[PDB]
Design an enzyme around this catalytic site. Structure first.
Site, PDB file in Angstrom:
ATOM      1  N   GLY A  20       0.841  -1.256   0.193  1.00  0.00           N
ATOM      2  CA  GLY A  20       0.095  -0.031   0.024  1.00  0.00           C
ATOM      3  C   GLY A  20       0.880   1.261   0.109  1.00  0.00           C
ATOM      4  O   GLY A  20       0.253   2.433   0.062  1.00  0.00           O
ATOM      5  N   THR A  21       2.074   1.038  -0.077  1.00  0.00           N
ATOM      6  CA  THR A  21       3.096   2.430   0.238  1.00  0.00           C
ATOM      7  C   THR A  21       3.188   3.147  -1.370  1.00  0.00           C
ATOM      8  O   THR A  21       3.577   4.224  -1.345  1.00  0.00           O
ATOM      9  CB  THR A  21       4.332   2.135   0.468  1.00  0.00           C
ATOM     10  OG1 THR A  21       4.977   0.993  -0.175  1.00  0.00           O
ATOM     11  CG2 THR A  21       4.382   1.769   2.024  1.00  0.00           C
ATOM     12  N   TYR A  22       2.564   2.358  -2.354  1.00  0.00           N
ATOM     13  CA  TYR A  22       2.610   3.148  -3.752  1.00  0.00           C
ATOM     14  C   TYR A  22       0.922   2.952  -4.351  1.00  0.00           C
ATOM     15  O   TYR A  22       0.818   2.763  -5.527  1.00  0.00           O
ATOM     16  CB  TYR A  22       3.592   2.526  -4.697  1.00  0.00           C
ATOM     17  CG  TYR A  22       4.661   2.322  -3.941  1.00  0.00           C
ATOM     18  CD1 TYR A  22       5.956   3.092  -3.919  1.00  0.00           C
ATOM     19  CD2 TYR A  22       5.148   0.732  -3.809  1.00  0.00           C
ATOM     20  CE1 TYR A  22       6.918   3.092  -3.144  1.00  0.00           C
ATOM     21  CE2 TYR A  22       6.370   0.724  -3.067  1.00  0.00           C
ATOM     22  CZ  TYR A  22       7.167   1.739  -3.056  1.00  0.00           C
ATOM     23  OH  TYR A  22       8.587   1.321  -2.272  1.00  0.00           O
ATOM     24  N   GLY A  23       0.249   2.751  -3.451  1.00  0.00           N
ATOM     25  CA  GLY A  23      -1.125   2.485  -3.958  1.00  0.00           C
ATOM     26  C   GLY A  23      -1.372   0.787  -4.401  1.00  0.00           C
ATOM     27  O   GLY A  23      -0.532   0.218  -4.001  1.00  0.00           O
ATOM     28  N   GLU A  24      -2.407   0.562  -5.035  1.00  0.00           N
ATOM     29  CA  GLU A  24      -2.628  -0.674  -5.406  1.00  0.00           C
ATOM     30  C   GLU A  24      -1.766  -1.059  -6.586  1.00  0.00           C
ATOM     31  O   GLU A  24      -2.061  -0.834  -7.784  1.00  0.00           O
ATOM     32  CB  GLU A  24      -4.192  -1.049  -5.617  1.00  0.00           C
ATOM     33  CG  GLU A  24      -5.007  -0.681  -4.487  1.00  0.00           C
ATOM     34  CD  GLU A  24      -6.444  -0.669  -4.873  1.00  0.00           C
ATOM     35  OE1 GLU A  24      -6.896  -1.773  -5.189  1.00  0.00           O
ATOM     36  OE2 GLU A  24      -7.328   0.361  -4.644  1.00  0.00           O
ATOM     37  N   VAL A  25      -0.706  -1.912  -6.257  1.00  0.00           N
ATOM     38  CA  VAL A  25       0.312  -2.132  -7.314  1.00  0.00           C
ATOM     39  C   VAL A  25       0.126  -3.774  -7.359  1.00  0.00           C
ATOM     40  O   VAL A  25       0.068  -4.344  -6.209  1.00  0.00           O
ATOM     41  CB  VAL A  25       1.746  -1.701  -7.363  1.00  0.00           C
ATOM     42  CG1 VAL A  25       2.624  -2.087  -8.303  1.00  0.00           C
ATOM     43  CG2 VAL A  25       1.763  -0.404  -6.885  1.00  0.00           C
ATOM     44  N   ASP A 131      10.792  13.406  -6.806  1.00  0.00           N
ATOM     45  CA  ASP A 131      10.721  12.607  -5.614  1.00  0.00           C
ATOM     46  C   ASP A 131      11.626  11.331  -5.501  1.00  0.00           C
ATOM     47  O   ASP A 131      11.348  10.135  -5.328  1.00  0.00           O
ATOM     48  CB  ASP A 131       9.151  11.920  -5.520  1.00  0.00           C
ATOM     49  CG  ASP A 131       8.821  11.449  -4.136  1.00  0.00           C
ATOM     50  OD1 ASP A 131       9.620  11.679  -3.300  1.00  0.00           O
ATOM     51  OD2 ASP A 131       7.803  10.832  -4.130  1.00  0.00           O
TER      52      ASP A 131
HETATM   53  C1  LIG Z   1       6.766  -8.760  -2.671  1.00  0.00           C
HETATM   54  N1  LIG Z   1       7.503  -7.578  -3.153  1.00  0.00           N
HETATM   55  C2  LIG Z   1       8.653  -7.311  -4.357  1.00  0.00           C
HETATM   56  C3  LIG Z   1       6.795  -6.212  -2.944  1.00  0.00           C
HETATM   57  O1  LIG Z   1       5.683  -6.202  -2.457  1.00  0.00           O
HETATM   58  C4  LIG Z   1       7.107  -4.724  -3.415  1.00  0.00           C
HETATM   59  C5  LIG Z   1       7.326  -4.542  -4.784  1.00  0.00           C
HETATM   60  C6  LIG Z   1       7.602  -3.271  -5.079  1.00  0.00           C
HETATM   61  C7  LIG Z   1       7.658  -2.818  -6.600  1.00  0.00           C
HETATM   62  C8  LIG Z   1       8.182  -3.840  -7.524  1.00  0.00           C
HETATM   63  N2  LIG Z   1       8.051  -3.444  -8.775  1.00  0.00           N
HETATM   64  C9  LIG Z   1       7.885  -2.356  -9.296  1.00  0.00           C
HETATM   65  N3  LIG Z   1       7.688  -1.924 -10.625  1.00  0.00           N
HETATM   66  C10 LIG Z   1       7.177  -0.676 -10.358  1.00  0.00           C
HETATM   67  C11 LIG Z   1       6.664  -0.334  -9.285  1.00  0.00           C
HETATM   68  C12 LIG Z   1       7.156  -1.511  -8.473  1.00  0.00           C
HETATM   69  C13 LIG Z   1       6.961  -1.703  -7.060  1.00  0.00           C
HETATM   70  C14 LIG Z   1       8.093  -2.363  -4.183  1.00  0.00           C
HETATM   71  C15 LIG Z   1       8.030  -2.793  -2.842  1.00  0.00           C
HETATM   72  C16 LIG Z   1       7.635  -4.015  -2.460  1.00  0.00           C
HETATM   73  N4  LIG Z   1       7.726  -4.436  -1.352  1.00  0.00           N
END
Ligand SMILES: CN(C)C(=O)c1cc(-c2cnc3[nH]ccc3c2)ccc1N
Ligand SMILES: CN(C)C(=O)c1cc(-c2cnc3[nH]ccc3c2)ccc1N
Lengths: 282, 282
Positions: A20-25, A131
């Site tokens: 949730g730190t970047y919305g719903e990814v 940012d």
């Molecule tokens: C299990 N896992 C790796 C994650 O939960 C995780 C994934 C990302 C992530 C990875 N790839 C990306 N590409 C574009 C945005 C983006 C964000 C960041 C932080 C995280 N804790």
């Protein structure tokens, strides 16, 4: 090219990303190629306009640099905007150091070099990341550094200062450019290096508006590293020059790639492979 | 002086105000004096700091002008911040003209004169309202004009551009001042006059980010009144000079009080008493 199609026609959603730190990814698998990707989905009000992003989406597409997270297309479907990007299995650096503890100077130097290479590419394209911080530096399972998405996560938040229709052109221009010059990412990078060194940016325990008040004072002193003896002179100077108060005297991204800290030999993804090992086991 | 006390010890809450367009504001009766007041209550996260408002609350208190809405003290109690202000029984102008229809030029001229008097006072105090528009111009049952609260409704929203701890001093300074000069309230006032004339600000049916993009173009034309013959030359010039593109050539609030539109005789609260009559009956 924003494919007006259900992104599930192309990919299979697997799990949430970022917590949730970047919305719903989402971590998603390509049905066809079998590749893994990331899908950032942003909700619509629907007072939003899909075409106001066009000028920003073309920015994220025309980025042919290995230190910027790759872009693979967008998707709009049922008030849901899906941004498809290169996946980075190790998450952000913030996710990493919140388990592994502080990073080493060599690790910071490699991450800084890679971020500078992306910044210097970004600024040569006359773009601004706006940012730069630990949470926006992604690591893949190869220990390679990837700057996160920029310019898209800003507008549509989607809330300004005043009210746009009654704003003045000077107010309108500042509500868009933000008084930004490319040389502020350099400052952001210096704060990030302190963040990667001390797990927290300078003044983290201080209310955000307070630190902004402090930075306008004529005698404001740019931050430093807390432990002098823990870091090298090159790192201490790198913090000093990146945290140059006046933007006129602040080195550019390319000039910083000439600095001792990031041009020294021995910087490679192995330093992060150590960090990803300290993540799973230790 | 932020009385850390339940505001119900002093006042009796009667009804909501504004219908949510300014947050939770209340019509409240003073137990002692029997007077009526307004109480704007803002919720705490509680990541907010009460002292970061001190510099802003002293601004709203040291305002001894009849065209600024009076301030009577603040109250903090159970993560609820109550701002006590002079009550205006007719609501905002936006509430009014959404029933009475468009305002007359004389009514606009009186409202503009009164707003200028408040602005010229505010700018002499080296303050900036930052959000002049119909919804922030309050009318009392005497038909008198009151500028709404400023500087307090901005910070703590409470959401910036970047992330405050990683921001640069130039980014920090712009996230606070906003590239603002006092002469932008003059522009805002010209847009408000068009708003009070046509029920809507220029480009209201256009997405907000789009109009901001339009205002940065080198050939951007400041807005005008739609119906030429409906308004006088004085009003058309007042719109032109208030909507001066370059802030260097834009007249100050005092200089605008010399303008034909607002220095003409015959401007008094009776024009608004007509408007408040057209509100209840017609
Ligand atoms: C299990 N896992 C790796 C994650 O939960 C995780 C994934 C990302 C992530 C990875 N790839 C990306 N590409 C574009 C945005 C983006 C964000 C960041 C932080 C995280 N804790
Ligand atoms: C019934 N009624 C008049 C309202 O609902 C009302 C009240 C206000 C109002 C009045 N006085 C104030 N003093 C400080 C802020 C403030 C806001 C604005 C709009 C409204 N529709």
């Amino acid at each position: 090219d924003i494919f007006n199609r259900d992104p599930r026609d192309h990919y299979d959603l697997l799990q949430r990303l970022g917590g949730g730190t970047y919305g719903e990814v989402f971590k998603a698998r390509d049905k066809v190629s079998g590749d893994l990707v990331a899908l950032k989905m942003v909700k619509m009000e629907p007072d939003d306009d899909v075409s106001t992003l066009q000028k920003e989406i073309l920015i994220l597409k025309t980025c042919r640099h290995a230190n910027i997270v790759a872009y693979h297309g967008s998707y709009l479907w049922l008030q849901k905007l899906w941004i498809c990007m290169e996946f980075c299995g190790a998450g952000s650096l913030q996710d990493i150091y919140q388990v592994t503890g502080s990073l080493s100077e060599l690790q910071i130097s490699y991450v800084c070099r890679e971020v500078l290479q992306g910044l210097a590419y970004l600024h040569s394209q006359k773009k601004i990341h706006r940012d730069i911080k630990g949470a926006n530096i992604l690591i893949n399972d190869a220990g390679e550094v990837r700057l996160a998405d920029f310019g898209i996560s800003a507008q549509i938040a989607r809330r300004l200062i005043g009210t746009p229709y009654w704003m003045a052109p000077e107010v309108a221009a500042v509500a868009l450019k933000g008084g930004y010059n490319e040389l502020c990412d350099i400052w952001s990078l210096g704060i990030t290096a302190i963040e990667l060194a001390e797990l927290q940016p300078p003044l983290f325990d201080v209310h955000p508006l307070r630190v902004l008040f402090l930075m306008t004072k004529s005698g404001y002193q740019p931050p430093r590293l807390k432990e002098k003896g823990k870091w090298s002179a090159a790192f201490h100077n790198f913090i000093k020059v990146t945290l140059t108060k006046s933007p006129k005297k602040r080195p550019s991204a390319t000039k910083m790639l000439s600095h001792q800290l990031v041009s020294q030999p021995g910087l490679n993804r192995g330093l992060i492979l150590d960090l990803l090992d300290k993540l799973k086991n230790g």
